[PDB]
Design a protein around this ligand. Structure first.
Ligand SMILES: [Cu+2]
Ligand SMILES: [Cu+2]
Lengths: 655, 655
């Protein structure tokens, strides 16, 4: 195909096709199907040389994952787009790949047409002639020791709608069909010892017509609040490259991680200084807390099992982004090797963010005063994973800080509850016969830093009282306290958790440089507090398949292609084996001090459902920030025009 | 005077005057001065009876604090405005009151004219004829065991401006004058053993003219982002009473706490349910961490030693509040007993707050979808405490949650640093010869709840893995986990801290009611995470004067007039004695389960200064929230008109 403007640009629909064509040719005569066709980003070293040392343009490569009918597992490899050839390929017969919307969408019809499933519905109080009202969310089996990776399986969380417009979640069924993805047939049905027939209650619906019926009527439309940017926006985009408030970076996107920000830097009044080479969400795990069979299989690693890209919502229509928006489209490949597009997958825009800073002198009753307002750049995406939606917002700020805001909304995963059955301690009865199980939403932020250049380190920062006691010459009044910096020398040293006791934060810094004022190295500080401990016991399915989740921080040596902490092919992996984070950690002895490192941060929330979350849940916020500390020698936004400003002398002139 | 519309309305300029006149007459022939004239809110019981049981209008009372020339301490009491008579009065000879801007504003001139002070300036390298270039921030002495409360004292943090438009903070002097407030004269000067003369560097300024000089020029004005509400706002204010999104409450204000929200309720579709009887910030402490003399004296309790009302900035001018704003004014009394007004002390308005909730069905490629945007109500104030500004935002949201957002900005407190002196572990060298000491900003949120009525309790909620181990019949895969609820029975039980290990949150609930769905009592959950431990040792000045700061939560029995946790008259109290929180706690044995309680939450941040905070610091955020959990039986904003909505059937018609 034709090369892209930038080496990190996602593959075009043409490159995708050229790739699939190349692969189909390689496997001529073989009945292959496409699971993934995505960009294989260039080597970190190659890229940087090209970008800053006049190095050559890296080869435009494509990474693929295919399935061959009658063959176990998958086959993966690389295609060198320029020469249209498969330059690397291999078969992984004992692994299962990410579930595309294509392998997922057929499942509902298959269980609907399965005699066994039909009998269970009838048993459950649903006539065999009404199977059209039976729905199901297709999930990976997650992991079921009965089959391992010997069969590509899915589990169907079954629900019932008395009307197509209903929200099915108030009416879950009690059984769980296991489906062979490839064979397209139910191979087993998990049935509870205690049977619970369909709820006979009205569905808990949320559309206006439903509401008008539920409560008298809808609230009157409210006076509008219109946002307008008459002279345009202040950011400038050159292809996928963004430019705003001295920040400059490339906005990428892929089937798995979704948004990928790269080559982030800041123009420090002429001096363009690197901050991060790449940053994104590399994995997740949403572990449920009911120990009852088969609920252990509910611990989805959405990024690696479905893909934040594959599940993304086209943003335009819903009014998700308010204001002067700038969109980006996403391109994948379908099962056939043909490009597929999802319009407005990413939405870019700037908004007001209140005050940036302010100060007035009390001496002239605040006449002397200066106010500068703040505006933030937001790069967003919103994806749907069956019942829930994850709204992601990468936020850049005018003080040099970068923040990740997430908002969880959508619908609670629900299971059936008997008339006289207690939601017990593992879940909440949010509606008659509905049980919403406890669960955690955990994310793994992957940061590849380049804080003010190459050669970085990480450290834990704990606030501490002076060791000297009250009344001592050294701490006479006992108010002394400082910040204890523990820089990680070895991988093992970094495996740390957030501690409230010390208001812990983590620094990613450049030990090769010093701030001329403070004397400290330049750095970006991770200020994250929503760091839940992994509640699943050690050695549990959850803990094993998500090795990265047991620690708030995991810092390992950089290596090309160390992206996914739970492994490259996550579905149905048992958790046994040295891959992903477990492999990168090794024996924990590798050096991570003043070298090229990778920082994986686990953050998230623990959800204990309340009726307020049903039938549709109000957004729940999660945030984390990376602030520059000792990076600059003074506040960097002081040359931004203030909103208001009166000098002391001027206040005098005004009389 | 004339009665106000609402019993909770602050005193009018008329009531203030009628009050001072009444006091002056009572102390006829005595040379008295006014320190405080404010509303003495009605008893909780009387107020409620009047509000909901047709009880009588409570008497309009005014609380005063006066000083009498030649008398030690102060005198306080109540005036029954209706009958214009002092109905209660008493003298506190061993106490010192809050510092008004009047007792604070004379200090700079007195040290300027003091011979001792002048000599120190000369010594420090500033000619005696340039004392007009010497400035000082007048602070409470805090507490100095050399004088106790025997004299009303202030300590002057001395600075130097080479030009009146300079920001003095880059040029602190090394000594600290002690001034007798009443006598208006320097009684002592703390001089360090190691002398450090005035810095000879340029001042670190931040006005545009300064910046143009510093860096080549200012950034070009940015394209505007205009916010317009053509058809008005959606909230309705009847006097101080606000009504918005089913919320209804009274917006009060006073010299000390600043904004005070009262009688908060929510209209649950016709059922008006109480939530909070009163909520506000009752005290603060900003303890510094340098153990060196006299820096122990830096631990300001701003609310009780200066007043969030007294220090508040008139909001209009600065462009603090963007959009269609509705202001409120504040009225206090000056030294003479004459009313004083600070216009636009509070600013009210509603803004966009992104998505409220959203959900799309993957079955018809998200055609089936519903999106409802969120708007929040903001009642704000911004006060200046010498060098820093505290921006306060009480936020009400459409899911029934209430949030308190704080943003810290302004300027770092700085002390002089020797050319070859290390800011050591206690502070940071943010600029040549400038040392910014470590410190914490802590706040005491006082909540008087009425969760869905009377008879409340509080509890600590901790996330826990099941006690049964991996492989046991009860937790076969080890994923089981729940929330441990520990409801406080006795005051002692409540003294708790936020714990990251359990992702702890606290519940204020009504044990007399039950959610018909979940079976739990109605409640509002405190989701707060920026809860720094008090770093000052026990028995320290800080820990003693701020009894409430040692715990994230303190729950005590309600009693009329239990407002200020550090006592009613905070300046110069040693911290020895049963008053404030220490008094309310008692032997910690009083019941707090299902009764009228008071919840004081300690939250804030620990500030380790970095050059980025100098010479003017970018806002630092702090937040805390109170969400309804089990209060409602379903999402309460479902009847808000969605921004977009397509039914499954409708998506079919659209073909
Ligand atoms: Cu959840
Ligand atoms: Cu601070």
């Amino acid at each position: 195909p034709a090369r892209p403007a930038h080496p990190l640009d996602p593959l075009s629909t043409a490159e995708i096709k050229a790739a699939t064509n190349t692969v189909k040719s390689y496997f001529a005569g073989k009945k292959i199907s496409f699971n993934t066709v995505t960009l294989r980003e260039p080597a970190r070293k190659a890229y940087i040389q090209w970008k800053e040392q006049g190095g050559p343009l890296p080869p435009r490569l494509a990474y693929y994952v295919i399935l061959e009918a009658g063959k176990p597992g998958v086959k993966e490899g690389l295609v060198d787009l320029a020469s249209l050839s498969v330059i690397e390929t291999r078969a992984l017969e004992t692994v299962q790949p990410i579930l595309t919307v294509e392998d997922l969408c057929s499942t509902e019809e298959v269980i609907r047409n399965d005699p066994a499933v039909i009998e269970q519905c009838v048993l459950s109080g649903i006539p065999a002639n009404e199977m059209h009202k039976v729905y199901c969310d297709p999930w990976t089996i997650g992991y079921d020791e009965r089959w391992g990776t010997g069969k590509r399986l899915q589990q169907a969380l079954v629900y019932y709608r008395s009307d197509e417009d209903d929200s099915q979640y108030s009416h879950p069924l009690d059984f769980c069909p296991i489906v062979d993805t490839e064979e397209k047939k139910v191979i087993f049905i998990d049935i509870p010892n205690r049977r619970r027939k369909v709820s006979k209650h009205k569905h808990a619906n949320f559309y206006p017509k439903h509401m008008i019926e539920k409560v008298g009527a809808m609230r009157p439309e409210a006076p509008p609040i219109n946002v307008t940017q008459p002279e345009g926006v202040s950011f400038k985009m050159t292809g996928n490259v963004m430019e705003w408030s001295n920040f400059k970076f490339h906005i990428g996107f892929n089937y798995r991680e979704g948004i990928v920000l790269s080559d982030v830097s800041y123009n420090d009044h002429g001096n363009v200084r690197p901050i991060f080479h790449r940053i994104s969400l590399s994995e997740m795990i949403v572990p449920y807390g009911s120990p009852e069979f088969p609920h252990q299989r509910k611990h989805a690693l959405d990024i690696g099992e479905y893909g934040a890209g594959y599940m993304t919502n086209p943003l335009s229509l819903g009014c998700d982004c308010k204001g002067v928006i700038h969109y980006l489209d996403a391109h994948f490949s379908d099962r056939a090797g043909d490009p597929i597009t999802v319009k407005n997958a990413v939405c870019i825009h700037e908004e007001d963010d209140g005050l940036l800073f302010k100060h007035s002198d009390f001496r002239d009753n605040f006449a002397t005063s200066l106010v500068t307002r703040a505006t933030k750049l937001v790069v967003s995406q919103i994806f749907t994973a069956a019942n829930y939606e994850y709204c992601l917002y990468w936020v850049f700020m005018q003080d040099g800080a970068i923040r990740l805001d997430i908002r969880l909304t959508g619908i609670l995963n629900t299971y059936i509850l008997g008339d006289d059955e207690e939601a017990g301690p593992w879940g909440t009865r949010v509606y008659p016969n509905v049980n919403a199980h406890n669960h955690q939403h955990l994310f793994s932020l992957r940061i590849d830093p380049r804080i003010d250049g190459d050669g970085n380190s990480a450290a834990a920062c704990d606030a501490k009282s002076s060791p000297y006691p009250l009344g001592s010459p050294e701490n006479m009044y006992g108010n002394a306290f400082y910040s204890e910096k523990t820089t990680f020398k070895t991988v093992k040293d970094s495996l740390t958790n957030y501690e409230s006791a010390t208001g812990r934060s983590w620094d990613i810094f450049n030990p090769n440089k010093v701030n001329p004022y403070s004397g400290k190295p330049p750095s970006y500080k991770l200020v994250s507090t929503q760091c839940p401990p992994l509640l699943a016991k050690e050695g549990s399915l959850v803990a094993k398949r998500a090795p990265w989740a047991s620690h708030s921080v995991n810092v390992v040596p950089y290596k090309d292609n160390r992206l996914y902490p739970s492994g490259d092919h996550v579905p149905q992996w048992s958790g046994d084996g040295v891959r992903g984070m477990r492999e990168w950690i090794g024996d924990g002895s590798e050096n991570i001090d003043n070298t090229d490192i990778l920082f994986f941060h686990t953050f998230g929330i623990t959800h204990f459902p309340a009726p307020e979350d049903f039938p549709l849940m109000p957004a729940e916020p999660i945030t984390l920030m990376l602030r520059p500390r000792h990076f600059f020698t003074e506040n960097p936004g002081l040359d931004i025009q203030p909103s208001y400003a009166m000098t002391t002398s001027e206040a005098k002139r005004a009389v």
